[PDB]
Design a protein around this ligand. Structure first.
Ligand code: ATP
Ligand code: ATP
Ligand code: ADP
Ligand code: ADP
Ligand code: MG
Ligand code: MG
Ligand code: MG
Ligand code: MG
Lengths: 536, 290, 245
């Protein structure tokens, strides 16, 4: 008759946000048979579920779920196992430790029967003790003998109906297969990264005891925090709040002359938006995706509009991103950025990717794999691509294709494994209802044509060089060098012909010219430009 | 009863050229343990329980850890020297790991929120803690140790009176699950000093000699600071030691039968010659030019 | 289910007789392997230009049959595998297929299984020999087996002397006339009313050489502009990409 839920309970009390669906499913599949009137439940001949498994990347709220589940129930205190804490040196005592966890349940069932309370058991890092059988071929065979005892005790010749085991792991591909059949561990949830609304809920949970004491200034707005925080887990949001609080507190402490804390101004403590911004930009840093310090590294000197080609390229990129976002017949789209060397392909591709406001953005450059062999490169590319399949809509950049596969005109010599991996990965669509965009950059279009790699791409965009005196003058004017009269001379001897130079080389030539004494700078610049004279 | 020692000043620490790093460490790890208890209770925040230190060899990572340990008047630190926790019998390394946190749990249970800080220092952390599933732990102690440590730091039961410090030169074998905001938040890099840092180090090291008039006026410190470039903190000390050794060896006159000329030892002083000879002959920097 | 719903994504429409012809030939082959006595092993090769819908047609032909065992071996599952792993995977799939009274195996994109590149050219011999040996050995007495292979380069296979191991080859063409293009557009329901009228007026003449997949891509690319410019953009794309046979 006594209920199994505590008389005073409330979903808000526990303090977990962003996992409503997971909790609903857990409650439906686990605790639905323990709340209905006994008479109907006993008229169906159904056995209660006695197993749960939770897995996911670190910091997504698993141990919190287990702790709150344990606290919710109106049962005895759960028996927790802190990792591999059931191992002993003596022979046969490792199993005797894993067999003492079920004594009370068995005794109570044999005493009352069909009316006993629940016995909750919690396993932390189940992968520590329960692993594949036949692996870990070391010595003493203790590991293979504990899995057998656990399986035989979970369900065997003897019957138990007042137990429930919860497991948590980060590597669910190592657990034994006979421990996951329906009956041992039936419910297998999956805790993942939160969405924007989940981020808002998490932020509002951890900022509830401060607003209630006028400790938080009204200047702060939570929508901005939820927007800027991308690829953030609950732990990282809590860490950000903690860092903001710490930097707010530190202003009232004087160091370098012993530790002295002012007790007069301490009654006017406040938390400002500046503290939050500084903490965001200094200490806290996520570890899933790409960060601003990478765009700041690829787009070094910004973008300057010296001609309409830049606008044309940017508009084409905008159209492609819109198509992939809205379209549903084509979940996979590709594009190739081609042109002469020193044109500005990588910066333009990075800018196009940045201006898309996608959740997941990544850049796969060849300078992070110096000295790698073929297998290492293939594994790295596969790992980078796999994460993009676990999001909602993502973009990926593959710059300098000719370096990913080691091309050299002599021979020619290159890598076939990487070429085939690329040719296969460019035509494989992501799971149902998910969308991907790929932007590849190169400088040798004919070679790609000879490899039958130019039809795997959906389209192509051309990035040209500076090819007129007016464009050169505009670039010089925008850069901010050779001004007033010094400019006029350059115009006199340049407008009467054509030029062929990239943008990177232009900066290099300007820097080279500026090192001479003031008088011979224009002459040196003109001589350097005339040396770099060519055409298609 | 603040955790801070009743007489502690940064000048007595003996560390020079690391002002910003120490300021950040103090702000992030020791700011919430000195504020009035009531305000911190109202805020409802948990303290940080992890620090990592990395950089090129010989730049002052163990000195900083030792001085931090000596700063706090709360018990004494518990040190772990390399792989000091490793046994052959099955299920004994983890038993060794579980004994480090016993007193913290016992005092937390008995007193609650009126406990004292407990420190644990892990020299060469990458000797035992490493990425799981990468190193071939045939026996299986390596993975199991990492799992035990992870489950003991942040697990079902909550602790609030511990602090763990780790020092490593290779900060990439470390597990990704141990470097998240929950477990180990503050991570710092110790790098080579600049001119002002070198001057501070040289002033710190040659302090007792100047007190006893054992330094001649011929030697200047600005020239020493300028002339030495890309010197780590462990090489200025070696230079000073070599200069002193030469100066003392000047007086001793013995080849076969040891003999000390006490008469000449009455007036001992070190000149520029010793420093120049040591610079030319003895000390060879690793990040400099030869 | 995953493979079936991932290969035949946008269904199969009827833009001309060739679809019906190919389906009928596949059904005849399935019937032949169902009730044969002297020929327990039958093979067929679907051949055509790129972007013509060969994988979808092969999967549909397999589905029309109700054989208890059906499998598709594709390179999507062998990214980064050395030739030894490829041989082992193929051997395991066929060995599993050898334990039933009826079976059907699809080998799509052969040229991506041999790791073929036209510079030299370079490929792998272990996989080629395994495939040449597995197309000729019969299953244990009283059993049947059907193998459907897909390729986009017939000449390469002919040079390696693989086109004789198969039993027959069936050709899969692409749109080659204005009537077919207009019917395909009508069955899709993308351009309608006066837009289709002007498209039909312009298309007449010059023929066309566009496959179904490329047509589906170009129809989606054009619908990202304003209503007044969609027809012109579509016509420009068709004129440029269309190329010639
Ligand atoms: N309008 C612009 N477009 C592109 N890059 C620009 C522009 N204005 C300035 N830049 C700067 O010029 C440099 C372009 O170099 P980038 O890395 O894009 O060259 P690249 O084409 O990838 O060369 P490489 O042949 O060496 O691979 C970057 O610093 C970019 O910031
Ligand atoms: N009658 C049809 N026949 C085939 N595919 C059709 C037909 N009508 C519509 N489609 C769509 O066209 C798609 C054609 O793509 P598919 O993967 O079959 O091409 P493919 O010839 O294998 O390409 P690739 O040469 O790149 O391997 C089919 O998946 C289906 O979505
Ligand atoms: N969904 C969530 N809702 C509220 N807080 C969360 C959530 N996820 C994580 N947190 C916060 O981050 C921490 C998560 O730690 P925990 O979940 O135990 O790590 P792990 O899941 O890797 O074992 C908790 O202290 C909690 O305050
Ligand atoms: N910042 C510093 N200030 C004063 N002395 C230093 C400093 N850095 C290094 N030293 C000296 O150099 C030595 C450094 O050794 P140690 O701290 O063990 O280096 P590490 O632990 O980084 O290998 C110490 O003996 C110390 O006296
Ligand atoms: Mg946990
Ligand atoms: Mg580039
Ligand atoms: Mg040391
Ligand atoms: Mg295909």
């Amino acid at each position: 008759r006594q209920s199994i839920i505590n008389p005073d309970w409330n979903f808000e009390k526990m303090g977990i946000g962003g996992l409503d669906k997971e909790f609903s499913d857990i409650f439906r599949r686990a605790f639905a048979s323990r709340v209905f009137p006994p008479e109907i439940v006993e008229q169906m001949g159904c056995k209660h579920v006695k197993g749960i498994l939770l897995y996911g990347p670190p910091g997504c709220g698993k141990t919190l779920l287990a702790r709150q589940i344990g606290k919710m129930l109106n049962a005895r205190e759960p028996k927790v196992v802190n990792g591999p804490e059931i191992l002993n040196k003596y022979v046969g005592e490792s199993e005797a430790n894993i067999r003492k966890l079920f004594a009370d349940a068995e005794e109570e069932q044999r005493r009352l029967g069909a009316n006993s309370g629940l016995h909750i058991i919690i396993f932390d890092e189940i992968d520590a003790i329960c692993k594949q059988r036949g692996s870990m071929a070391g010595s003493t065979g203790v590991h293979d003998t504990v899995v057998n005892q656990l399986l035989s005790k979970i369900d065997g010749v003897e019957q138990l109906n007042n137990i429930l085991v919860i497991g948590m792991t980060n590597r669910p591909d190592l657990i034994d297969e006979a421990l996951l059949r329906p009956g041992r561990l039936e419910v297998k949830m999956e805790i993942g990264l939160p969405d924007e609304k989940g981020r808002l809920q998490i932020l509002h949970i951890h900022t509830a005891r401060m607003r209630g004491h006028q400790l938080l200034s009204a200047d702060v707005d939570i929508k901005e925090l939820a927007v800027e925080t991308k690829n953030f887990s609950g732990a990282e949001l809590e860490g950000l709040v903690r860092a903001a609080q710490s930097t707010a507190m530190n202003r009232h402490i004087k160091a370098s002359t012993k530790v002295e804390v002012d007790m007069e101004k301490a009654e006017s403590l406040q938390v400002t938006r500046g503290d939050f911004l500084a903490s965001l930009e200094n200490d806290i840093k996520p570890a899933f995706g790409t960060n601003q310090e990478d765009y700041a590294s690829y787009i070094m000197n910004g973008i300057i509009k010296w001609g309409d080609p830049v606008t044309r390229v940017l508009d084409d990129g905008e159209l492609l991103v819109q198509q992939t976002k809205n379209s549903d017949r084509t979940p996979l789209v590709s594009v190739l950025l081609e042109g002469p060397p020193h044109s500005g392909k990588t910066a333009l591709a990075a800018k196009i990717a940045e201006e898309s406001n996608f959740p997941f953005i990544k850049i796969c450059s060849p300078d992070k794999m110096i000295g790698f062999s073929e297998t290492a490169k293939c594994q790295a590319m596969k790992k980078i691509f796999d994460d993009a399949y676990k999001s909602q809509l993502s973009c990926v950049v593959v710059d300098d294709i000719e370096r990913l596969l080691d091309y050299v005109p002599i021979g020619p010599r290159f890598s076939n494994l990487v070429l085939q991996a690329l040719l296969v990965l460019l035509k494989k669509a992501p799971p149902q209802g998910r969308k991907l965009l790929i932007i590849g950059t190169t400088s040798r279009k004919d070679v790609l044509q000879e490899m039958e790699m130019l039809n795997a791409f959906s389209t192509t965009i051309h990035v040209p060089n500076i090819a007129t005196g007016e464009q050169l003058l505009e670039a010089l004017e925008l850069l901010g060098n050779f001004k007033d009269k010094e400019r006029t001379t350059i115009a006199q001897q340049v407008k009467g012909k054509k030029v062929w130079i990239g943008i990177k080389k232009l900066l290099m030539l300007i820097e080279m010219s500026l090192q001479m004494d003031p008088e011979y700078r224009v002459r040196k610049f003109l001589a350097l430009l005339r040396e770099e004279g060519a055409s298609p």
